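The following block was generated as part of the benchmark described in Methods. Ligand: zinc ion.
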Amino acid sequence: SIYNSFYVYCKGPCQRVQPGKLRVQCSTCRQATLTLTQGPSCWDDVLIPNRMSGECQSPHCPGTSAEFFFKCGAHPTSDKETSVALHLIATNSRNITCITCTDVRSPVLVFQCNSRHVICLDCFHLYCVTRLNDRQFVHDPQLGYSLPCVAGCPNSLIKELHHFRILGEEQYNRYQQYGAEECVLQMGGVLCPRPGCGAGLLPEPDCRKVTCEGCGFAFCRECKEAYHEGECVDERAAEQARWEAASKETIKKTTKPCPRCHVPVEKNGGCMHMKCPQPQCRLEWCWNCGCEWNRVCMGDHWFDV
Ligand SMILES: [Ba+2]
Ligand SMILES: [Zn+2]
Ligand SMILES: [Zn+2]
Ligand SMILES: [Zn+2]
Ligand SMILES: [Zn+2]
Ligand SMILES: [Zn+2]
Ligand SMILES: [Zn+2]
Ligand SMILES: [Zn+2]
Ligand SMILES: [Zn+2]
């Protein structure tokens, strides 16, 4: 791949986050025969059903709605082996610094707070890890447990919870226990301190001794050891790590010459498919690759955020 606009979670054989491939099909016949009037320009175009229309080229099909889906890109996949789109994840093509480590990384996660704060995938991992260990996830009835923007911005809870698959199998599994553990705690119960167990227990609240009967561990609850009979975000960083913030000038400009005629072209939205405005040229080309348009570019970066 020359360029990846998308990333998915590949349940296997990657069991990890990977660059994904975009696909489209008639939502009536489910064939690869919908021509779109207009290509996608943003995540909504591909995530909201029937938002995008074409003509299904099957002789005897009348469907005009598109249905988009994604696939892992790290290897072959069957015509429809679907991966979940991690739509918060973006290639950092404008070299924006991260809100927490302040390095330039790629890809990044972009919170859907108003400020559209940017965090690298390393810091997102750690953010998630920290917030587990410290029971700092946030509940929401219609979601369960999630995390907001790292900067503390409201209405910024991650809704597509497959974004936590960024934690690797085990951290991820901790994450899935979290509600269940929280239940016990919220009833004055306790978790087994034994590493690898962490099972839920509810003794009488005025007992300092607690036995896991799990893995057998007796422990003192006040201090979580085995049972003794004795006694026991920077402000500038935030401002800078904003998706839509005004930036310097990179290598990759915001005016580029048509590959055929060489007239400078402005790009006026998210779709990577360009059509040269010149009446006497009209080349269709990819904004990024500088080449005639094609199904690879469609697959890999039909649009960019
Ligand atoms: Ba002692
Ligand atoms: Zn894969
Ligand atoms: Zn059809
Ligand atoms: Zn970072
Ligand atoms: Zn934010
Ligand atoms: Zn235990
Ligand atoms: Zn103790
Ligand atoms: Zn041209
Ligand atoms: Zn391209």
